[PDB]
Amino acid sequence: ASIAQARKLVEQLKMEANIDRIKVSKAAADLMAYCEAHAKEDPLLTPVPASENPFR
Amino acid sequence: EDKAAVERSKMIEKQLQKDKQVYRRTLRLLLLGADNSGKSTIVKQMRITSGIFETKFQVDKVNFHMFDVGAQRDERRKWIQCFNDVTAIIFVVDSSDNRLQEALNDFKSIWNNRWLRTISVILFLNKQDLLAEKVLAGKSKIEDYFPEFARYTTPEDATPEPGEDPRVTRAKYFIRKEFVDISTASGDGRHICYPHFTCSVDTENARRIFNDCKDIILQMNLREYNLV
Amino acid sequence: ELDQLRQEAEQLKNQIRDARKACADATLSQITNNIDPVGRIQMRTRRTLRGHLAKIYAMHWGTDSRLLVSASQDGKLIIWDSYTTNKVHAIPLRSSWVMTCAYAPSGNYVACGGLDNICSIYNLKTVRVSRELAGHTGYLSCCRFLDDNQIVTSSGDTTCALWDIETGQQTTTFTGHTGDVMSLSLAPDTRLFVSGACDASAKLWDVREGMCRQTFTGHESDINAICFFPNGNAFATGSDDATCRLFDLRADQELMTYSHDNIICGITSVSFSKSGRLLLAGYDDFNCNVWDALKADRAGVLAGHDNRVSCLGVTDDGMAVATGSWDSFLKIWN
Amino acid sequence: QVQLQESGGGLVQPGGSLRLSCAASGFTFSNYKMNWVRQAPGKGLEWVSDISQSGASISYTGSVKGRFTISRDNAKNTLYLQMNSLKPEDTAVYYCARCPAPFTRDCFDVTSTTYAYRGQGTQVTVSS
Amino acid sequence: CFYNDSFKYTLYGCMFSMVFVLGLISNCVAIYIFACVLKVRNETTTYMINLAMSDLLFVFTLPFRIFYFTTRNWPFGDLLCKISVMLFYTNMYGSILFLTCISVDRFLAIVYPFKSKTLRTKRNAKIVCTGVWLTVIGGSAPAVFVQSTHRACFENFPEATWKTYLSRIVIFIEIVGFFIPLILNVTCSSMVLKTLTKPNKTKVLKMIFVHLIIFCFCFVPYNINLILYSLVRTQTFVNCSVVAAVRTMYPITLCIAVSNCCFDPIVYYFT
Ligand SMILES: CCCCCCCC/C=C\CCCCCCCC(=O)OC[C@@H](O)COP(=O)(O)O
Ligand SMILES: CC(C)CCC[C@@H](C)[C@H]1CC[C@H]2[C@@H]3CC=C4C[C@@H](O)CC[C@]4(C)[C@H]3CC[C@]12C
Ligand SMILES: CC(C)CCC[C@@H](C)[C@H]1CC[C@H]2[C@@H]3CC=C4C[C@@H](O)CC[C@]4(C)[C@H]3CC[C@]12C
Ligand SMILES: CC(C)CCC[C@@H](C)[C@H]1CC[C@H]2[C@@H]3CC=C4C[C@@H](O)CC[C@]4(C)[C@H]3CC[C@]12C
Ligand SMILES: CCCCCCCCCCCCCCCC(=O)O
């Protein structure tokens, strides 16, 4: 039963090693840009006044 | 509107109180054992791809629910965590078969777990007649797996059953002390082990469970009233 | 014959590792070194919900950010109104060893499962058992709705499944893990999902095809929780080695690690805020920690439970957090 | 990526001796307990020996006491087993295992199924 | 015959005030714990908080009697001192009843572990405490049919009052508030002691002895002396040696009973 498992693992590894990758700096820059474009819509980060808190 | 919502909530609360009143009065037990043990025979001695089974019985107007595990895998370090608040664990061992080291390792792993260190264990050493026949046959030895048995003597304070041979008593006592040593070695002072010798024709096991659970609840009461 | 295939796997793994290291030129830490921190964060308890009898294993918010469903092992599902603390529904279960629950995005159905290996589906707007799904060979550990006629489940038999409800037939199966699958999460576009298991790895799956895209490693022990970033291009995991980690899909490797030297207990739950700047984690100490996601600094603590924290959740507008633990109480923080 | 690699093994005469080594990578080696396990031709998996994290506590089965010794090396991340006075009833495949979680007292699952933190194993034969 | 017991006018003053500075602290400390250091709820907590509140209300009513006994004058009218004595006696009997409740609860808990889960819940404890309060403050009402204007109140009554009015109150309170609780407490403690000696147990036998001994020692002598005092005041026997002995021994007791209010928050607590 090990021969089939080894063949399947080899096939999966061959399938995985054929993808394109980007650099870490670009991914980090995108994460920062998304976090900073949506900073004013977060009420757990910048709490809203009491008159708009439904859990007051 | 608001009044209807409050009315519905109150009705639900009444039903919940009714449910709690009966939930608090039943005793839940978890049953464990290997395939070579006679666990199904024990569960069949009680008169009242599926994953779990339940059995209900009653003694002296007290209700017991006992749970057994069905179609699972070998790994059990994840679904054991569901059983941290049961009253007791019933552990069944085949004492005539060797595979005793596996049983001792299982008991040691159950005793020392972090989420199961306040739960007491009732231990059933099954198949006494087979052990007696094997000992009297003389074709097998115990010093082949537990060498220290060569230097063991039955204590003078023993109370043997009337009629048993000395050899059977010696084997019995060594095997029981093997589990009691693990039970007492770590410990907590907050849970206890109760050992019994059993066979496949006994009609006394329900009474033994009843008595041990009585003692467990008494000890918990004494601990909550700050007397011991 | 087997040795040749083992060798082939070895060279393939080495090629993957070399190609992966060939892309790491900087770190997230060196690029966020010049931003203003968030400071110290206070939160307060607003509600306490009482009524369960035993441990609580699961919760799930509704899409209106008002209604809750919770599951305990006394054998109950309770559906709550959170603004007024009223009870709307109480449902008794046939087996009391329940371990997961979910809320339908349209508000019409709920689902549950556990040690009986069956996923049960209840209709709220007619409460009778609408349907039962059978076919797994191990305990059900998670489930999430896709619409009112599809569902995805994870089991402790090392497989995932996709079910069509009306016919009641298991329509797709996802295999490739080697241990118990413990958590799922759906991507915001609902065309991919990630899973994590007890072999200390995570996998990315395509729903429409049935094949694995990518594998992620780096943890040391079993993985208990998983969650997507709001963008849909990254995700965070928590394990039993007392560590959280953040991975990126496009660069195909780990980005960051959140850990401390006084924490020696496992992690049971993770979740993101609405903008993705804070990461909240539930612990076995007895309480919860709030981390800064972009600088890996501990920003706050939520305390006030008397036993093991089991589950967390954040609303779809970001207004409140809800936490449940083994002491039978649910708390809402704002 | 958790990795364990065993070395040693081979064919020895009855009454001989051997020394097996194991090298571990991908985790903090000094936080865990270590185990030696073995499997015989035609049988299941069997627990052989146990060692703790600081080397203070040791444990063996009854059928090997006085012949096998277990040892640890934290700086080099290595585990050792020393086997003396081999018998023909020791012919088996040996594996190294470590417990699933750190800073813990109870142990792992000794299971035929894929336990994720076990090695490939080495073959030991004792015959003439 | 003759007697000389004026020393009571000092003996009370030197002692009662002392009690006021002990209990007012100790009880408060206990209540502060019950406020929040323990976060555990069960029947014993209910009984202990009721007992502590009763003790504190008893402590607050001592200064008026201190002033009376130190200045020998009462420029306040009869109503205030009448209310004072009613509060005194009602609290000093509620204490007995609550201690008996605790004893019976322990007996039921550790003699019948299975046939009592249907009798031990917090709602029943609330019902019983409400009943105790009602029955203890529903018996002090008739004391409003006195004069107490001999100024001086509740001292040196005429022989007409004792012969018809006070004796029946005394017999009622002695019949209800001392004897049945004593029998119940002793029998429950005896059965609990004999059910744990059947074939460490050095910390389960000392507690029962301490509780029973304190109860008996602090409450028996006053009740015996009070029944004898009622007999001698009603003038049923004229052996003046016994008369002098009883009237002299009455002031020296009633101090152990009032000293009991500072022994509860140290014995039942801190264990
Ligand atoms: C449920 C059972 C009843 C529990 C509640 C008890 C109610 C008692 C409350 C008020 C009744 C007051 C009765 C007082 C009895 C007499 C007290 C006393 O010791 O008086 C002697 C003395 O000073 C009078 O001065 P002399 O005339 O010089 O002796
Ligand atoms: C006649 C007057 C002056 C006596 C005063 C009555 C007061 C002190 C008594 C009467 C009813 C009593 C309450 C009865 C029930 C409980 C619930 C328990 O969980 C806490 C104590 C508490 C809250 C008691 C507090 C003291 C109490 C309020
Ligand atoms: C003057 C009266 C009110 C005193 C009452 C004494 C109480 C404490 C006594 C007398 C009657 C007793 C009950 C009588 C009946 C039973 C059933 C028996 O199988 C267990 C004990 C139990 C449950 C007793 C509990 C204690 C009990 C309620
Ligand atoms: C003549 C009168 C004064 C006798 C009064 C006896 C009292 C002290 C007895 C009679 C009934 C008894 C109660 C009967 C039932 C229970 C319920 C249990 O949950 C706590 C103990 C408790 C509350 C007992 C406490 C003691 C008790 C209240
Ligand atoms: C001197 C009188 C004192 C009265 C003490 C309480 C007596 C009334 C108690 C009634 C309830 C007792 C039984 C509880 C019944 C129940 O379980 O609900």
Residues with CB under 6 A from ligand 3: E 104, 108, 112, 115, 119
**Overall resolution, Å:** 2.9
Q: How far apart are CA C94 and CA C163, in angstroms?
A: 22
Cβ of residue B74 closer than 8 Å to a chain D Cβ: yes
- In SS3 terms, A4-25 reads as HHHHHHHHHHHHHCCCCCCCHH
Using DSSP's 3-state secondary structure scheme, residue E50 falls into helix
Tell me, in angstroms, the distance from the centre of ligand 1 to residue C160's CA: 81
- Overall number of domains in chain E: 1
> Which structural domains are found in chain D, ordered by start?
3-103+119-126 (2.60.40.10)
Q: How far apart are CA D69 and CA D19, in angstroms?
A: 10
CA atoms within 13 A on the CB side of C150: 11
* Pair B161, B145: CB distance under 8 Å: no
User: Residue E1 falls within a domain, yes or no?
Assistant: no
Chains that touch C (3 or more CB pairs under 8 A): A, B, D
Cβ of residue B78 closer than 8 Å to a chain D Cβ: no
* Pair D61, B98: CB distance under 8 Å: no
Structure-block tokens of residue E76: 């306040």
Residue E108, domain extent:
8-267
> Which structural domains are found in chain B, ordered by start?
2-224 (3.40.50.300)
Structure-block tokens of residue D87: 């018998």
Torsions phi, psi for B225 (to 5 deg)? -90, 5
* D/B Cβ contact: 3+ pairs below 8 Å: yes
DSSP E169-189: HHHHHHIIIIIHHHHHHHHHH
Structure-block tokens of residue B139: 């074709």
Torsions phi, psi for E110 (to 5 deg)? -115, 20
Q: Output the domain CATH number for residue E68.
A: 1.20.1070.10
Determination approach? cryo-EM
What is the interface size between B and D, counted as CB pairs within 8 Å? 38
Tell me, in angstroms, the distance from the centre of ligand 5 to residue E45's CA: 18
Q: How far apart are CA B200 and CA B91, in angstroms?
A: 16
DSSP character at residue D94: E
Q: How far apart are CA E206 and CA E204, in angstroms?
A: 6
Residues in chain D after which the backbone breaks (C–N beyond 2.5 Å): none
DSSP character at residue D118: B
DSSP C115-179: TTSEEEEEE-----EEEEEE--SS-EEEEEEEETTEEEEEETTS-EEEEETTTTEEEEEE---SS
Dihedral sign (CA C203, C204, C209, C211): negative
Using DSSP's 3-state secondary structure scheme, residue C194 falls into strand
E strand or H helix that includes residue E12: helix E8-36
* Pair C271, C314: CB distance under 8 Å: yes
- Ligand 3 atom index nearest CA of E184: 6
What is the residue with the minimal CA distance to atom 10 of ligand 2?
E133
* Pair A24, C233: CB distance under 8 Å: no
Q: How far apart are CA D96 and CA A11, in angstroms?
A: 28
Exposed e or buried b per residue across C175-186, where buried means at least 16 C-beta atoms within 10 angstroms of its C-beta: ebbebbbbbbbb
- In SS3 terms, chain B reads as CHHHHHHHHHHHHHHHHHHHHHHCCCEEEEEEECCCCCHHHHHCCCCCCCCEEEEEEEECCEEEEEEEECCCCCCCCCCHHHHCCCCEEEEEEECCCCCHHHHHHHHHHHHCCCCCCCCEEEEEEECHHHHHHHHHHCCCCCCCCCHHHHHCCCCCCCCCCCCCCHHHHHHHHHHHHHHHHHHHHCCCCCCCEEEEECCCCCCCHHHHHHHHHHHHHHHHHHHHCCCC
| CB–CB contact E204 B214 (8 Å) | no
Ligand nearest to the CA of E154: 1
> Any idea of the CA torsion for E99, E105, E109, E112, to the nearest 10 degrees?
120
E strand or H helix that includes residue D36: strand D34-39
- Selecting from C46, C275, C320 the residue whose C-beta is nearest the C-beta of A42 gives C275
* Pair B196, B209: CB distance under 8 Å: no
Q: How far apart are CA D76 and CA D71, in angstroms?
A: 12
Structure-block tokens of residue B152: 């063991």
- Selecting from B74, B77, B113 the residue whose C-beta is nearest the C-beta of D100 gives B77
User: CB-based burial of residue E145 (10 Å sphere; 0-12 exposed, 13-18 middle, 19+ buried)?
Assistant: exposed
D58 beta partners: D51
* Pair C290, C247: CB distance under 8 Å: no
Q: How far apart are CA B221 and CA B228, in angstroms?
A: 10
User: Residue E72 falls within a domain, yes or no?
Assistant: yes
Residue of B nearest to E112 (CA): B218
User: Residue E243 falls within a domain, yes or no?
Assistant: yes
The shortest C-alpha distance from E59 to chain B (Å) reads 28
B3 beta partners: none
Pocket-testing residue among E115, E118, E132, E183, ligand 3, by greatest number of atoms within 8 A of Cβ: E115
Cβ of residue D112 closer than 8 Å to a chain C Cβ: no
Q: How far apart are CA C20 and CA C110, in angstroms?
A: 42
Structure-block tokens of residue B205: 């096991």
* Pair C118, C155: CB distance under 8 Å: no
Identify each DSSP E strand in C168-219 by its residue range.
Answer: 169-174, 181-186, 192-197, 202-206, 212-216
Q: How far apart are CA D68 and CA D49, in angstroms?
A: 9
Other Cβ atoms closer than 10 A to E151: 13
Tell me, in angstroms, the distance from the centre of ligand 3 to residue E104's CA: 9
Beta strand B27-33 with B62-69: parallel, antiparallel or unpaired? parallel
Pocket-testing residue among E47, E127, E129, ligand 2, by greatest number of atoms within 8 A of Cβ: E129
Structure-block tokens of residue C60: 């799930």
Tell me, in angstroms, the distance from the centre of ligand 3 to residue E125's CA: 15
Tell me, in angstroms, the distance from the centre of ligand 2 to residue B172's CA: 61
Residues with CB under 6 A from ligand 5: E 119, 124, 127-128, 131-132, 135
Q: How far apart are CA C80 and CA C76, in angstroms?
A: 13
What CATH number does the domain located at A3-55 have? 4.10.260.10
DSSP C267-329: EEEEEE-SSS-EEEEEESSSSEEEEETTT--EEEEE---SS-EEEEEE-SSS--EEEEETTS-
What is the residue with the minimal CA distance to atom 13 of ligand 5?
E124
Residue from D77, E247, C139, C85 nearest B2 by CA: C85
CA atoms within 13 A on the CB side of D45: 18
Q: Output the domain CATH number for residue C250.
A: 2.130.10.10
Q: How far apart are CA B199 and CA D32, in angstroms?
A: 41
Using DSSP's 3-state secondary structure scheme, residue C196 falls into strand
| CB–CB contact C156 B82 (8 Å) | no
Exposed e or buried b per residue across C74-93, where buried means at least 16 C-beta atoms within 10 angstroms of its C-beta: bbbbbbbebeeeebbbbbeb
Task: Name chain B contacts of C88, Cβ cutoff 8 Å.
Answer: 5, 8
Torsions phi, psi for E93 (to 5 deg)? -95, -35
Q: How far apart are CA B187 and CA B203, in angstroms?
A: 31
Look up residue B95 and give its amino acid.
Answer: S
Using DSSP's 3-state secondary structure scheme, residue E24 falls into helix
Beta strand B88-94 with B27-33: parallel, antiparallel or unpaired? parallel
CA–centroid distance for B166 within its chain = 28
* Pair C157, C174: CB distance under 8 Å: no
Using DSSP's 3-state secondary structure scheme, residue C238 falls into strand
Q: Which residue has the tokens 């792992």?
A: D108
Task: Name chain B contacts of E204, Cβ cutoff 8 Å.
Answer: 222, 227-228
Long-range contacts of C121-125 (CB under 8 A, 24+ apart): C121/C151, C121/C165, C122/C77, C122/C91, C124/C79, C124/C89
Q: How far apart are CA C192 and CA C187, in angstroms?
A: 6
C204 beta partners: C194, C214
User: CB-based burial of residue C117 (10 Å sphere; 0-12 exposed, 13-18 middle, 19+ buried)?
Assistant: buried
Q: How far apart are CA C277 and CA E236, in angstroms?
A: 92
Q: E161: Cβ–Cβ under 8 A, 6 or more apart, which residues? A: E146, E147
Residue from C248, C315, C247 nearest C280 by CA: C315
E169 lines ligand 1 (CB under 6 A): yes
Dihedral sign (CA C212, C218, C223, C229): negative
Beta strand C321-325 with C330-333: parallel, antiparallel or unpaired? antiparallel
User: CB-based burial of residue E207 (10 Å sphere; 0-12 exposed, 13-18 middle, 19+ buried)?
Assistant: middle
